[PDB]
Design a protein around this ligand. Structure first.
Ligand code: NA
Length: 129
């Protein structure tokens, strides 16, 4: 599923991401935009052989099991393919664990390089939230 901007904002708010660990909703929509272009089916391979999955590009090195990342962890206790669903519940609940691990949203390289320090509230402008 390719989400619309406000559709994703509304779904992220309903799942409790608005101001989660202090990060306003615009941060999460900005992150999703530059990580996946709002596409739940996005995948990208990393140099070490791990793979990033879903609308927030969660990594198999630490967070999910894809059966092809030997020696890795599965801290969200899910198969990585669950992160590609049109239902974003698994992505959001795993993201909540990531953002809580000490580095905040700096864990998402696209957020640090394209969202941090900008007017992130612009990403929810116009939405009925
Ligand atoms: Na893994």
């Amino acid at each position: 599923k390719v989400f619309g901007r406000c559709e994703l904002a509304a779904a992220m708010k309903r799942h409790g991401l608005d101001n989660y660990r202090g990060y306003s909703l615009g941060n999460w929509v900005c992150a999703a935009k530059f990580e996946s272009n709002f596409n739940t089916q996005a995948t990208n391979r990393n140099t070490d052989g791990s793979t990033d999955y879903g609308i927030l590009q969660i990594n198999s090195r630490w967070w999910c099991n894809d059966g092809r990342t030997p020696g890795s962890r599965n801290l969200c206790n899910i198969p990585c393919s669950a992160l590609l669903s049109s239902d974003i519940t698994a992505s959001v609940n795993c993201a909540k664990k990531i953002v809580s691990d000490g580095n905040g949203m700096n864990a998402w390289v696209a957020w640090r390089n394209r969202c941090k320090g900008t007017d992130v509230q612009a990403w929810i402008r116009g939405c009925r939230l």
